[PDB]
């Protein structure tokens, strides 16, 4: 169930513009960079404490 | 990195009536005032003999941004839920989800100050912690 | 140049509440560099506990500092008549307001009047390219 | 030049209520560059929810900073007398106020006074060409 | 010149309310460029709806900043004694106040004091040429 | 030389209310150019209608900005100890205060402390030549 | 090396309220030129009639602006954890505080945080030479 | 020829706003080698953040140092009259101004005056061959 | 060649942002010995404490003194147009700027105009051989 | 050595949007002005009767150099970190790390006057000390 | 003797962190300007009608001296106490102890200008006084 739910949450990055280590996001683009993705994934994991994961 | 400032601001708009999602669109800082944070979801109060009363409260964010001309101005003044994501220069990332604008101000149509409220705001704490 | 912040045209239409006399739309000019300030959200929110927010009904307001026209009585700018304001910015944005009412008239010196206009809703034009 | 903001003439007439003696209309001089300030509309609005406006009766006020006349007692400028003030601007507009009263007299130094004059209505003259 | 704004003489007479000892009149000098400030009209007015005014009794007050005399105790300048203050301006105006009282004393540094004197009525000399 | 406005000596005697330990009189210094401010008249007046005044009892307060001594705890300057202040000005005036008590402690940075002393009465020595 | 005002060491120990994890004591640094501000006497006084004072129980507060450490979450600086702060000034004074709580978390920009620390008692080390 | 920076003619017409009397256009002479300066764009921008500008309405100023004529009162050059300037340069460029006003009169010795002229707009003639 | 600080070519393109035309790119000439001064870093820093820097967003400015072209109106050089400037130095460096905007126009004598161009970013060419 | 002036100047550029390290490259003086130092990281302030208020501040360094034609000008105006090291003719060597340019000024593309801020500046103090 | 100038300048350093005493080391002027003094410890202020408000103040000292290569530059810029004594050519001796540089200024590593503030400054007043 946790794998299926994580696949649900991560589906939003399909086709999304990604700006890698080289530079950052300019103005008006709908892209993202690995740090923001990691932060959002951490937020999603934290919000599911008590139903899927342990405390931490 | 000894450089205080923001590098990217991402906002996602969710209209409260039509349930349409737009974003995450990068945004632009209007002036020299940086976004201001408050993570502790409890508001304390001074009492006597050093005691303190802990009352439940909300996590806020004062985020001044430049509006995007492809987004209606009403979205920045409480007509849509916001999913804000701000990354500082020193690697810190503030993540906010399911926010709301509480006290909209009379804006001139270019720069808007967003008083956002969420249950809790995440911190990324660039490597090396505790 | 879509990089300029400011107003280009300001049209105001005065309607008398009693005689139903329509005057306008008369173009106007700014008294100083202070731009009109806007609020297109009809709901005023309030901070509550743990991210919850209370939605309460409110108005789409507009603060409009303009120079009065010598052909229109000053009382028309201070709540004795209806106003239908339409402001066009330099980048193509157009805010349309109809059936507004000046709620809090302020002491004016006969040249520059700051109008606090309250209406049911305000329409935005969003120069081409939306969402 | 028609493009001129200022005051050309200021006339004030004092009518003591106790003895019914009329003094004036004497001419007066400004103490500084602050122009007289008006509020003509006799109704005050209040903001309600979703475009509604509560309309209630109020006054027509006027703020008049001038220099006192050395032949007139200072008490006449601080609410012990009925004032009949009439002000003409450089652009031709004339403000006429009759049967006015000073409401909140602040203390003055004996040369420059500021009147908060209240009246039922104030008349606008609107130099030729109107509506 | 006949065109000058400023004070020329300030006399204050102190009467002790306990032992009935009278001191003065003693000339005083300004501590700064701020002139004594007057309110002569004994009635106060309150704005009402549509031009009406409510008249109620009030006081004739004065604000008087002076340099205290080193021969007079500081307590006499802060409401523990009667004051019979009298001020003459350069243009000929003379304001007379008798049996006054200091209402709200303030923390003085020991040299300059600011009196807020409240009395029943203030008399004006109104230099020759009146009404 | 006379005609100089400033403080010459400040003597403070501490008497803790817990252990009844007496320290002083220790001399002190000003932290900046602000001078101590005084209020000797033990009664406070309040304005009533038409000249009348209501006389009520109050204190003889005192504001004393000083530099704390490094041999005295900071808590002694913030209401944990009685103070017996005695300030002599350059012009010979001596204000003696006994059995004082700081009433409104304010956070201090560890060098400069502003003390709001309140006492039953303040004595003034009034340099020679009186009344 | 006296005659200098400022802090030399700032030590803060964080104790989590729900996990009970102890972190520190970590040294911190000022964000600007404003020095930490203290208040030792744990009783707040008040003014009464004729020099009487009412002693009401209060706290020994301490205002402390510091630059947050990047290894500690920002929420720890805004009231989600206890603090055991200890500050040493350049003149040898040391303020020791245990079991402190931040009362009014003010919004911070992510680098500089202003603490309003409240604790039962603050102890002064009082460099050698006392009373 | 062609490459010659300098003024060839300066015509000034004086109109008295009180009596509507017209004097001019009288040719004038430069006092030194400092040329008159211009500002044609009626909008004054302002540097906002990251390529944005704040277009607000403003004037089309003109600084014109000229030699006084002995047949025209000095007050006519210091704001007591309406000036219509028209300057032609050596290369054919003609600057036309109408209904200007001297905004900031600077003290002059009676022969050389500098005028800060403000007008709604200024016309440029652009010698033949343009765009 | 290298080791020759100067400017070789300056090209400006004018687009009137009222009626949407285009003029240029037109070569221009330097008025004096002063060279254009540049600022490519779109972020303006500030000195915080302990070696900290507050990066605040700003513009990429450009100061360009040029001799105006007699075929182009002067108002185009003072903010009533959009400029696409492009400059090449003697050492091969090329600065390209598009959608410029003059922010603070000053008085000009009609031949030499000092621009203050502001754009979101300025391009650099780095003559061959980099890093 | 009874001579005042700089002998070698070395700057290392570290980008902030890409983290590319360039240097340490040598540079040359643009004019007769010498690089100017301030080492004491505490700014004092006059108070009443000899007391002084020691407030935290920075160790600054003003450094005019001729920009290298192989480096973008933006790197000289605060869009990057600088690792500056200056050596004088008398043996003194000043070392600076993690520095940033505070107030960039409008430069002509040849001479840039850096206003560099840093936490601390280290002095080499040619042999023979105290 | 009628010769305006300094003959001896002695400075004693005392570090603000290690409490290490250095000096008194003689010094030399960098240029033709002389030290400027303010002995009176009270500052007057103009009031109305010939009155003056005496407020407590400091005794200042402006001392331009050549940096000594055996002493760190930070000791000349407020990181250490100074005990300065200056003797003029006419016998006047100014003694200042337990000073503190208040407004450090950017220096080139050779010449520094001290702004010294102390509680009092002594004067020796060559023989024959009052």
Automatic annotation (TrEMBL), chain A:
This is Tail sheath protein. Transmembrane segments: none annotated. It comes from Agrobacterium phage Milano.
UniProtKB/TrEMBL annotation, chains B, J, K:
It comes from the Viruses. This is Virion-associated protein. The lineage of its organism: Viruses, Duplodnaviria, Heunggongvirae, Uroviricota, Caudoviricetes.
């Amino acid at each position: 169930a946790t794998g299926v739910a994580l696949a649900e949450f991560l589906q939003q990055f399909n086709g999304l513009a990604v700006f890698t280590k080289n530079t950052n996001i300019r103005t008006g683009i709908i892209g993202t960079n690995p740090r923001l993705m990691l932060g959002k994934i951490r937020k999603w994991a934290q919000d599911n404490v008590g139903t899927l994961f342990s405390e931490f | 990195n000894k450089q205080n400032g923001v590098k990217n601001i991402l906002i996602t708009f969710t209209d409260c009536d039509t349930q349409e999602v737009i974003g995450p669109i990068s945004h632009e800082q209007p002036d020299d005032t940086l976004p201001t944070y408050k993570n502790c979801a409890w508001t304390n109060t001074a009492l006597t003999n050093g005691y303190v009363q802990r009352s439940a409260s909300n996590a806020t964010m004062t985020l001044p941004v430049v509006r995007d001309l492809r987004v209606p101005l009403a979205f920045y003044q409480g007509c849509a839920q916001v999913d804000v994501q701000v990354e500082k220069f020193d690697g810190t990332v503030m993540t906010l989800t399911e926010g709301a604008v509480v006290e909209p101000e009379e804006s001139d149509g270019r720069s808007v100050t967003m008083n956002i409220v969420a249950s809790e705001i995440d911190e990324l704490l660039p490597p090396g912690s505790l």
